C-alpha cells in the first residue's frame, strides 16, 4: 500500500537511511489501524 513513502518517511524522521523491512510493515499495519480509527471517530463527531 505505501512501503516506499513509509521508508523515506521513517528516514526523514531519524531512522537508518535504509530501515528493516519487518519494521516498515509493522508500521504500515499501525498506520492502517490508525486511519481506520480516525475515520470511525470522525464519522461520529
Amino acid at each position: 500500500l505505501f512501503s516506499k513513502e513509509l521508508r523515506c518517511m521513517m528516514y526523514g524522521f531519524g531512522d537508518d537511511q535504509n530501515p528493516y523491512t519487518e519494521s516498515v510493515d509493522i508500521l504500515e499495519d499501525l498506520v492502517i489501524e490508525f486511519i481506520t480509527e480516525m475515520t470511525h471517530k470522525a464519522m461520529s463527531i
Binding site: 500500500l1 505505501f2 513513502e5 513509509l6 523515506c8 518517511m9 521513517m10 528516514y11 526523514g12 524522521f13 531519524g14 531512522d15 537508518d16 537511511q17 535504509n18 530501515p19 528493516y20 519487518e22 519494521s23 509493522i26 508500521l27 499501525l30 498506520v31 492502517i32 490508525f34 486511519i35 481506520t36 480509527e37 480516525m38 475515520t39 470511525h40 471517530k41 464519522m43
Partner: protein, 89 residues
C-alpha cells in the same frame, strides 16, 4: 553540514502517502466517497502519527543501548509507551 543531513531533510520534507490508497482505504469504510481535502488532511495527520512512533521508537532503541535501523521490538515498545502517555489512540 553533511550530504546526509541534507538528504534526511529532503526525505522528511517530501515524504507523503499516495492519495489513491488513503482515499480507497477511507471510502471503503464510509461506503460514501470522500473529498480531496479529507484525503490530504488524513495524510497530514498520519504523517504526524508516523513521526511520533519513529521518534518514540528511536528513543527506546537509544535507551536499550542499541543502534538504528529501528527493529520491530522498538516499534511495538514505542506504541505501548505512547498509549500509556495517552498521546496516540
Amino acid at each position: 553540514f553533511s550530504e546526509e543531513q541534507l538528504n534526511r531533510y529532503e526525505m522528511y520534507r517530501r515524504s507523503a502517502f499516495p492519495k489513491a490508497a488513503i482515499k480507497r482505504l477511507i471510502q471503503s469504510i464510509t461506503g460514501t466517497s470522500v473529498s480531496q481535502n479529507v484525503v490530504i488532511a488524513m495524510s497530514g495527520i498520519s504523517k504526524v502519527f508516523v513521526g511520533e512512533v519513529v521518534e518514540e521508537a528511536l528513543d527506546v532503541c537509544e535507551k536499550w543501548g542499541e543502534m538504528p535501523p529501528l527493529q520491530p521490538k522498538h516499534m511495538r515498545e514505542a506504541v505501548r509507551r505512547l498509549k500509556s502517555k495517552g498521546q496516540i489512540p
